[PDB]
RNA sequence: GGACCCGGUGAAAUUGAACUGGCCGUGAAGAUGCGGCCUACCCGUGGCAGGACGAAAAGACCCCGUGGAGCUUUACUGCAG
RNA sequence: GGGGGAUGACCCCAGGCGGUAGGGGAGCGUUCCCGAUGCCGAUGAAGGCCGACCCGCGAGGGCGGCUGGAGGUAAGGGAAGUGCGAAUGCCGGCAUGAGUAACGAUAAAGAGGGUGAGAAUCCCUCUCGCCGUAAGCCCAAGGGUUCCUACGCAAUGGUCGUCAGCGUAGGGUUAGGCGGGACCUAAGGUGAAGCCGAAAGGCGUAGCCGAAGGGCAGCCGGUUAAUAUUCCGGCCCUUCCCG
RNA sequence: GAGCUGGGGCUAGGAGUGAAAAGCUAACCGAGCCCGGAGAUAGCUGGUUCUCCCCGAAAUGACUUUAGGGUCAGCCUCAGG
RNA sequence: ACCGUGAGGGAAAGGUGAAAAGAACCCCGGGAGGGGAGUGAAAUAGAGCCUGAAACCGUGGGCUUACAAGCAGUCACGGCCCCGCAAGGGGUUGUGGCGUGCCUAUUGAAGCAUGAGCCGGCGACUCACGGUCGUGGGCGAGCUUAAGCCGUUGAGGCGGAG
RNA sequence: GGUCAAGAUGGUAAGGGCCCACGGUGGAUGCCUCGGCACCCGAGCCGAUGAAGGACGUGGCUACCUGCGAUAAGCCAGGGGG
């Protein structure tokens, strides 16, 4: 499940209602190809009178988003895709925007 | 009045049981068949 | 303004229950209440329950005023049938249908000008 | 007996015509001599029944 | 004990569609359905069984098929013995 | 068919035009391909529901409105799982008969009280009735949680259900002596040796397997919601091993 | 008593079994059931689906183990002469 | 699964939404179910969930019907309701005229001869290799390749045994 | 206004037909498919070192499927990967 973005990442929402808005990816769900970018794509769930918020009727949580819906931010502006540099010894991500690391 | 099914557990295994089947070439093929079909039970139970 | 209750999947035959629904249609809720209690049929119970749930829905929801109410409309439609095998002589086996009703009472405010 | 059978499926018209007598009639009802409510005659009220004898007690 | 009435549950064969009367005729020769005439307000319930050539079962009788099967023998041709 | 000579579609004129088996000829529609990296499309595809409207002899094609929510696919050509009303056709759905017959032994019910949203139908009491070489009790087959208890009533129960052999969950089956096996052999079965058979396989003395028969040591009572010759109490016994 | 019966066994498809009916052999036995040869064969019965336009039959001859089936001829049609 | 002692036979049954955001809470009710509230672009997309045809069942409305008789239609006029400026049209049906169901098999069927309860799906003249006519084209005293071989975004060409 | 003889026409629907509208039932139709089907490549044995195929088990809670074997939704090492 190859993905692109990870939990630390800082991503922009590229489409939909929340289009335009940068936030940080809170979690990542490879099984669903979905990222949760709170605060973004919040929604109202109703809830019952059991313990905590017994009195509480509603709770605002935030929905996952299709992973394709977002792009890594690149500590210059709004983009990139990404590239992969090997060098020595190994491993990578690299903003092809260009050209920056990808940090944490 | 007396019907055709008169269950007796000894008779069943002695007649349609696994070791009956394996004695006779005829019987062995009933196993070969039942397996190739993918039957869940090669042989009745008791 | 008007209010409504609908019972769904009531296990009863429409023909049977449709009969008592006829019995109270276009009646003030106070006579309709009276009749169903003293009407002798199994489907009187079920219909009164709908009438009521629609009386409640009148005052409590649509701001109706109970003492002005009558039955504007009512009817029972036929929900899906419960089919059971019934075995028979010389090994025959029919299938009986236990039928199912969708009961509807619709309430209105008597002109009460 | 040779087992008679209907010869022709009967029509909607004719069955519903059959049924033209099947309508129910509402219960005949009188106001109770005391209580607010309605009762069928020559009977004791479900609620607070009579005078000349001990009625079933909603009293 | 059923059948009948009331409350509960609720099948079945069958079913081209029906707004499905009587007589004398006619018609593939036995007409609710065509002609003439007679009779007849609409709808049921309990009943009888004369009719719908009523239901059931692609007639078992009969004949057809260069259809089948069991049986026989100094039919034919083989085989065991 | 004959004129007009557009070389035919157009225009006059004149004739033919009932039809089963069957022959011929033109078209319509459906699925797919090329056209297509195109074009139509959310300002709404396919499909659906209406139309008294337009074009076509007709099969059909348009158009408008409603529904519907992501596909559709010209002109021109190609290829076929291509058009249903019937086959006691096949598969499904839903009708009629009909609120009809029936509700499964004519042993038989009645009342009071309880519980519960709801009671002829569940629980308790009293009365009445039926079985009693059973319709009572115990064992073997066979069945396989149906057992006991708590919660429960959608369905199963031929009505009803608060109940159940039903749903959920928890619990419950205790053996040296009872039954079977670490014993015996029976019909049969299997089978060293042996024999026969194209192959598969058939036979066969010994042996071995095979039981409701032979052989072998536990009786009475108490206990649990549910097990008891199994646990417990008392009284007895068997076999192996070692002194 | 040529009695009835439980448990354990043996015999089967041209085969078994039968105090004999062609009985019985897993609710249809003048030859069990299942799967296969297999879409056996069926000169028979049924059924064969959009539209328009032109023409338009036969139910006779001859031969036929043929007679409700065929072959040739006759009668329909279409193309060229 | 289920059916059969057994060998063996052998089904049905897919779809909310872009996302559960899968309807807190209140009301009738024993629950089921519904009504508000809420979510949603949409909730007759609400889980018995896309579209949602037809038989079939039901509620409401218009016209009609209790001295007429019938393959249920059809032609005419008239009444009532609807739409339209009008002339006009849609609905319904009172009366009058005419009127022997579909298919199949037959010399001949409304036939009292077969088939069909009704609706929706499925359901029957094909394909290969030969042949024989016709037709559209290529070449013409000639025509033509088969296997195979080379080559290929679904690219062709070679090959003369026959 | 109203007595009165003849004539004569209208509404009426227990129920039923046709039309229209809105639903119930039912699941056709269109679209969707990661299932099937055909060809062409590729690849082609396993088994006493106990196969193929099973039984019974195996999770803190576990009905079934999948995995796995009392070391039981897994143990050791190498490669991969981030
Ligand atoms: Mg890229
Ligand atoms: Mg006996
Ligand atoms: Mg049986
Ligand atoms: Mg036994
Ligand atoms: Mg298994
Ligand atoms: Mg019976
Ligand atoms: Mg029986
Ligand atoms: Mg009799
Ligand atoms: Mg006559
Ligand atoms: Mg007539
Ligand atoms: Mg006539
Ligand atoms: Mg007549
Ligand atoms: Mg009668
Ligand atoms: Mg009679
Ligand atoms: Mg009688
Ligand atoms: Mg008779
Ligand atoms: Mg017969
Ligand atoms: Mg016959
Ligand atoms: Mg006979
Ligand atoms: Mg013969
Ligand atoms: Mg002319
Ligand atoms: Mg003609
Ligand atoms: Mg556009
Ligand atoms: Mg399409
Ligand atoms: Mg819309
Ligand atoms: Mg549309
Ligand atoms: Mg076909
Ligand atoms: Mg036809
Ligand atoms: Mg029949
Ligand atoms: Mg059917
Ligand atoms: Mg039925
Ligand atoms: Mg009925
Ligand atoms: Mg009754
Ligand atoms: Mg009757
Ligand atoms: Mg009766
Ligand atoms: Mg009765
Ligand atoms: Mg009884
Ligand atoms: Mg109480
Ligand atoms: Mg006694
Ligand atoms: Mg037992
Ligand atoms: Mg059982
Ligand atoms: Mg119990
Ligand atoms: Mg209890
Ligand atoms: Mg129940
Ligand atoms: Mg019940
Ligand atoms: Mg239980
Ligand atoms: Mg032994
Ligand atoms: Mg042997
Ligand atoms: Mg021996
Ligand atoms: Mg021995
Ligand atoms: Mg013994
Ligand atoms: Mg013994
Ligand atoms: Mg002993
Ligand atoms: Mg004891
Ligand atoms: Mg006990
Ligand atoms: Mg015990
Ligand atoms: Mg003891
Ligand atoms: Mg015996
Ligand atoms: Mg025996
Ligand atoms: Mg035989
Ligand atoms: Mg005998
Ligand atoms: Mg059998
Ligand atoms: Mg028999
Ligand atoms: Mg035979
Ligand atoms: Mg056949
Ligand atoms: Mg053959
Ligand atoms: Mg033959
Ligand atoms: Mg055939
Ligand atoms: Mg002609
Ligand atoms: Mg002849
Ligand atoms: Mg013949
Ligand atoms: Mg000829
Ligand atoms: Mg079984
Ligand atoms: Mg609720
Ligand atoms: Mg909103
Ligand atoms: Mg709603
Ligand atoms: Mg809709
Ligand atoms: Mg929708
Ligand atoms: Mg549905
Ligand atoms: Mg969708
Ligand atoms: Mg829907
Ligand atoms: Mg509908
Ligand atoms: Mg109506
Ligand atoms: Mg008269
Ligand atoms: Mg009249
Ligand atoms: Mg009449
Ligand atoms: Mg007329
Ligand atoms: Mg027919
Ligand atoms: Mg015939
Ligand atoms: Mg005939
Ligand atoms: Mg004849
Ligand atoms: Mg007929
Ligand atoms: Mg008839
Ligand atoms: Mg007949
Ligand atoms: Mg016939
Ligand atoms: Mg059809
Ligand atoms: Mg077809
Ligand atoms: Mg040809
Ligand atoms: Mg040619
Ligand atoms: Mg040529
Ligand atoms: Mg050449
Ligand atoms: Mg009425
Ligand atoms: Mg529905
Ligand atoms: Mg294994
Ligand atoms: Mg497992
Ligand atoms: Mg590693
Ligand atoms: Mg590594
Ligand atoms: Mg690495
Ligand atoms: Zn940058």
């Amino acid at each position: 499940v190859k993905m692109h973005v990870k939990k630390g990442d800082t991503v922009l929402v590229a489409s939909g209602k929340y289009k335009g808005r940068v936030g940080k990816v809170k979690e990542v769900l490879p099984k669903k190809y979905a990222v949760i970018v709170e605060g973004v794509n919040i929604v109202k769930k109703a809830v019952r009178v059991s313990p905590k918020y017994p009195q509480g009727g509603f709770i605002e949580k935030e929905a996952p988003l299709h992973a394709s819906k977002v792009r890594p931010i690149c500590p210059a502006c709004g983009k990139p895709t990404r590239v992969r540099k090997k060098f020595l010894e190994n491993g990578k991500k690299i903003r092809v925007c260009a050209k920056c690391g990808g940090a944490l | 009045m007396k019907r055709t099914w008169q269950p007796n557990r000894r008779k069943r295994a002695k007649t349609h049981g696994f070791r009956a089947r394996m004695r006779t070439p005829g019987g062995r093929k009933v196993l070969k068949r039942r397996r190739q079909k993918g039957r869940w039970r090669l042989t009745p139970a008791v | 303004m008007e209010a409504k209750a609908i019972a769904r999947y009531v296990r009863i035959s429409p023909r049977k229950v449709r009969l008592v629904v006829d019995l109270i249609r276009g009646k003030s809720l106070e006579e309709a209440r009276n009749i169903l209690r003293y009407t002798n049929k199994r489907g009187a119970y079920f219909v009164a329950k709908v009438l009521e749930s629609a009386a409640a829905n009148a005052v409590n929801n649509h701001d109706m005023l109970e003492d002005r109410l009558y039955v504007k409309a009512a009817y029972v439609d036929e929900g899906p049938a419960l089919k059971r095998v019934l075995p028979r002589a010389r090994g025959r086996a029919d299938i009986i249908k236990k039928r199912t009703s969708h009961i509807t009472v619709i309430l209105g405010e008597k002109h009460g000008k | 007996a040779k087992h008679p059978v209907p010869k022709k499926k009967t029509s909607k018209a004719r069955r519903d015509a059959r049924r033209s007598h099947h309508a129910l009639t509402p219960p005949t009802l009188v106001p109770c001599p005391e209580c607010k409510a309605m009762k069928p005659p020559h009977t004791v009220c479900p609620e607070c029944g009579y005078y000349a004898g001990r009625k079933v007690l909603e009293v």
Side-chain angles (χ1 to χ4, degrees), chain D residues 7-48:
Chain D
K7 178 62 138 181
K8 257 323 161 175
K9 162 189 207 179
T10 109
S11 83
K12 297 168 186 165
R14 205 182 284 256
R15 67 127 129 71
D16 299 330
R18 161 144 30 89
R19 282 147 192 205
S20 65
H21 309 264
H22 292 162
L24 301 149
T25 73
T28 97
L29 289 184
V30 31
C32 158
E34 261 269 62
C35 328
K36 141 115 192 291
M38 300 283 243
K39 278 87 197 227
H42 305 67
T43 9
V44 191
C45 306
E47 295 92 31
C48 262

Side-chain angles (χ1 to χ4, degrees), chain C residues 37-109:
Chain C
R37 187 245 196 268
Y38 284 99
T39 274
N40 177 0
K41 272 246 129 61
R42 180 228 213 188
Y45 167 94
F46 301 96
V47 163
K49 289 195 61 160
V50 166
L51 215 222
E52 238 60 20
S53 167
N57 278 349
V59 196
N60 262 154
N61 278 53
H62 306 72
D63 273 327
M64 283 231 86
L65 218 191
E66 201 258 57
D67 295 89
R68 217 129 131 252
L69 297 168
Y70 77 127
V71 190
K72 193 186 228 168
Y75 51 83
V76 10
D77 286 348
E78 159 121 43
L82 271 279
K83 292 181 287 211
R84 274 68 191 119
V85 158
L86 160 58
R88 228 107 199 281
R90 323 217 36 130
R92 213 224 156 258
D94 305 328
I95 66 101
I96 93 287
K97 300 220 276 182
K98 321 245 223 185
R99 310 223 175 208
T100 270
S101 315
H102 295 344
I103 327 193
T104 307
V105 182
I106 294 174
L107 245 26
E109 260 167 297

Side-chain angles (χ1 to χ4, degrees), chain A residues 6 65 67 79 82 95:
Chain A
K6 70 206 329 181
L65 266 19
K79 299 149 56 258
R82 50 81 272 189
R95 285 82 219 114

